[PDB]
Write an enzyme that holds these catalytic residues in place. Sequence first.
Site, PDB file in Angstrom:
ATOM      1  N   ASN A  27       4.871  16.488  -0.230  1.00  0.00           N
ATOM      2  CA  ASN A  27       3.452  16.437  -0.727  1.00  0.00           C
ATOM      3  C   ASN A  27       2.756  17.488   0.191  1.00  0.00           C
ATOM      4  O   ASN A  27       2.661  17.366   1.384  1.00  0.00           O
ATOM      5  CB  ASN A  27       2.884  15.063  -0.646  1.00  0.00           C
ATOM      6  CG  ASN A  27       1.412  15.044  -1.033  1.00  0.00           C
ATOM      7  OD1 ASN A  27       1.032  14.222  -1.801  1.00  0.00           O
ATOM      8  ND2 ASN A  27       0.646  15.975  -0.551  1.00  0.00           N
ATOM      9  N   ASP A  69      -0.226  18.978  -0.224  1.00  0.00           N
ATOM     10  CA  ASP A  69      -1.683  19.000  -0.213  1.00  0.00           C
ATOM     11  C   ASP A  69      -2.279  20.327  -0.640  1.00  0.00           C
ATOM     12  O   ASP A  69      -3.118  20.913   0.077  1.00  0.00           O
ATOM     13  CB  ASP A  69      -2.257  18.539   1.104  1.00  0.00           C
ATOM     14  CG  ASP A  69      -3.770  18.341   1.033  1.00  0.00           C
ATOM     15  OD1 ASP A  69      -4.293  17.770   0.074  1.00  0.00           O
ATOM     16  OD2 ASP A  69      -4.418  18.760   1.987  1.00  0.00           O
ATOM     17  N   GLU A  91       1.316  17.145  -5.068  1.00  0.00           N
ATOM     18  CA  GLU A  91      -0.010  17.638  -4.808  1.00  0.00           C
ATOM     19  C   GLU A  91      -0.076  19.140  -4.802  1.00  0.00           C
ATOM     20  O   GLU A  91      -0.605  19.784  -3.909  1.00  0.00           O
ATOM     21  CB  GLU A  91      -0.694  17.021  -3.622  1.00  0.00           C
ATOM     22  CG  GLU A  91      -1.570  15.827  -3.954  1.00  0.00           C
ATOM     23  CD  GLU A  91      -2.903  15.802  -3.256  1.00  0.00           C
ATOM     24  OE1 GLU A  91      -2.895  15.555  -2.019  1.00  0.00           O
ATOM     25  OE2 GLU A  91      -3.956  15.969  -3.872  1.00  0.00           O
ATOM     26  N   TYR A 132       4.214  12.030  -7.846  1.00  0.00           N
ATOM     27  CA  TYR A 132       3.043  11.877  -6.920  1.00  0.00           C
ATOM     28  C   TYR A 132       2.241  10.692  -7.540  1.00  0.00           C
ATOM     29  O   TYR A 132       1.626  10.896  -8.614  1.00  0.00           O
ATOM     30  CB  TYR A 132       2.206  13.142  -6.980  1.00  0.00           C
ATOM     31  CG  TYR A 132       0.835  12.990  -6.392  1.00  0.00           C
ATOM     32  CD1 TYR A 132       0.669  12.490  -5.109  1.00  0.00           C
ATOM     33  CD2 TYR A 132      -0.293  13.322  -7.109  1.00  0.00           C
ATOM     34  CE1 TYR A 132      -0.586  12.347  -4.580  1.00  0.00           C
ATOM     35  CE2 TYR A 132      -1.558  13.208  -6.588  1.00  0.00           C
ATOM     36  CZ  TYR A 132      -1.705  12.705  -5.303  1.00  0.00           C
ATOM     37  OH  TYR A 132      -2.965  12.583  -4.775  1.00  0.00           O
ATOM     38  N   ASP A 171       5.759  11.069  -3.342  1.00  0.00           N
ATOM     39  CA  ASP A 171       4.780  10.410  -2.571  1.00  0.00           C
ATOM     40  C   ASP A 171       4.304   9.259  -3.462  1.00  0.00           C
ATOM     41  O   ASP A 171       3.584   9.451  -4.457  1.00  0.00           O
ATOM     42  CB  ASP A 171       3.728  11.392  -2.116  1.00  0.00           C
ATOM     43  CG  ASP A 171       2.464  10.714  -1.796  1.00  0.00           C
ATOM     44  OD1 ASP A 171       2.399   9.544  -1.442  1.00  0.00           O
ATOM     45  OD2 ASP A 171       1.453  11.496  -2.034  1.00  0.00           O
ATOM     46  N   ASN A 223       2.599   6.521  -2.647  1.00  0.00           N
ATOM     47  CA  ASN A 223       1.330   5.943  -2.271  1.00  0.00           C
ATOM     48  C   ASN A 223       1.341   4.474  -1.974  1.00  0.00           C
ATOM     49  O   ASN A 223       0.483   3.676  -2.378  1.00  0.00           O
ATOM     50  CB  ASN A 223       0.230   6.345  -3.281  1.00  0.00           C
ATOM     51  CG  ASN A 223      -0.410   7.683  -2.903  1.00  0.00           C
ATOM     52  OD1 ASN A 223      -0.421   8.652  -3.635  1.00  0.00           O
ATOM     53  ND2 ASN A 223      -0.910   7.702  -1.670  1.00  0.00           N
ATOM     54  N   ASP A 263       6.372   8.377   1.584  1.00  0.00           N
ATOM     55  CA  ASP A 263       7.347   9.141   0.826  1.00  0.00           C
ATOM     56  C   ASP A 263       8.747   8.542   0.948  1.00  0.00           C
ATOM     57  O   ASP A 263       9.229   8.221   2.037  1.00  0.00           O
ATOM     58  CB  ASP A 263       7.341  10.613   1.241  1.00  0.00           C
ATOM     59  CG  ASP A 263       5.963  11.177   1.369  1.00  0.00           C
ATOM     60  OD1 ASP A 263       5.308  11.086   2.391  1.00  0.00           O
ATOM     61  OD2 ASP A 263       5.570  11.809   0.297  1.00  0.00           O
ATOM     62  N   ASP A 323      -0.813  16.972   5.378  1.00  0.00           N
ATOM     63  CA  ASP A 323      -1.077  15.706   6.076  1.00  0.00           C
ATOM     64  C   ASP A 323       0.153  14.809   5.960  1.00  0.00           C
ATOM     65  O   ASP A 323       0.236  13.722   6.562  1.00  0.00           O
ATOM     66  CB  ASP A 323      -2.398  14.982   5.634  1.00  0.00           C
ATOM     67  CG  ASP A 323      -2.602  15.073   4.176  1.00  0.00           C
ATOM     68  OD1 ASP A 323      -1.761  15.551   3.494  1.00  0.00           O
ATOM     69  OD2 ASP A 323      -3.770  14.613   3.713  1.00  0.00           O
ATOM     70  N   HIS A 324       1.109  15.282   5.145  1.00  0.00           N
ATOM     71  CA  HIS A 324       2.418  14.639   4.928  1.00  0.00           C
ATOM     72  C   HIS A 324       3.473  15.572   5.489  1.00  0.00           C
ATOM     73  O   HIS A 324       3.270  16.786   5.559  1.00  0.00           O
ATOM     74  CB  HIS A 324       2.810  14.544   3.457  1.00  0.00           C
ATOM     75  CG  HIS A 324       2.109  13.478   2.718  1.00  0.00           C
ATOM     76  ND1 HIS A 324       2.795  12.404   2.164  1.00  0.00           N
ATOM     77  CD2 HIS A 324       0.780  13.357   2.407  1.00  0.00           C
ATOM     78  CE1 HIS A 324       1.884  11.650   1.579  1.00  0.00           C
ATOM     79  NE2 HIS A 324       0.679  12.222   1.661  1.00  0.00           N
TER      80      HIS A 324
HETATM   81 PB    PB Z   1      -0.494  10.367  -0.392  1.00  0.00          PB
HETATM   82 PB    PB Z   2      -3.673  14.407  -0.585  1.00  0.00          PB
END
Ligand code: PB
Ligand code: PB
Length: 274
Positions: free
Chosen positions: A26, A28, A54, A127, A166, A168, A239, A264-265
Amino acid sequence: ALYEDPPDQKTSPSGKPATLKICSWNVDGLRAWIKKKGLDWVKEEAPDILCLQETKCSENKLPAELQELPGLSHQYWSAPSEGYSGVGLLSRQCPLKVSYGIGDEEHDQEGRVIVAEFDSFVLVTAYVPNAGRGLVRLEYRQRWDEAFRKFLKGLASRKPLVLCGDLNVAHEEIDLRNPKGNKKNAGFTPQERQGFGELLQAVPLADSFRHLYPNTPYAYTFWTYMMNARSKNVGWRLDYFLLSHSLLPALCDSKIRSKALGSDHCPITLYLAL
Ligand SMILES: [Pb+2]
Ligand SMILES: [Pb+2]
């Protein structure tokens, strides 16, 4: 507080060497990712298959570098009809077939799922819709979960399955730094956790990482950009590499590439002996 991913294990329990390397990430935002060198990382990783979440970038607006990707040239992408969601799948070898979404019009409009079929298995990358700030999307999330599960179930019924992305959701407490303070936040609600478990049981699927590292704490894949999180290892394990039970034997390793920057992942890598 610390976490150090153990060394790559490159043979199956039975002694067969890994023949397939899958990397999931992911990012971002594609361009923001490429910018903070994510591409270079990939280069060193040299996976056979690369799954991105993402992208927040349409296939028409794809960055040039990408097509150049030497060893991964059969590339598919899905995104909402810019700057939000979207997923991608790049492979060294050409898949038998590529499809999108989960067959449910309500859930198929935000470019979140790619289905790639191979010889000995099917790969799904996704995602997952986040429950949102204030759990305002929780209800939607629950509908999604059910629909996804069902879809996967049908898929697995036909071919062994590998699901990455990802998702979530931090499954259990061991899956995040602060379970107490997060029970009411997206990604650690009971609803979400419950959904995950159901996924596991119903498909059924096995959590690759957890399967190999059943009692391993401090292992995350996401840290909020805010408040120095990543630095203090205040994260979540969002993830996964979920596998059909039948693939367990082919399982060599499920990694968590902690230090890889760009988002951020962090990425995750799966090793299979097919
Ligand atoms: Pb996420
Ligand atoms: Pb994000």
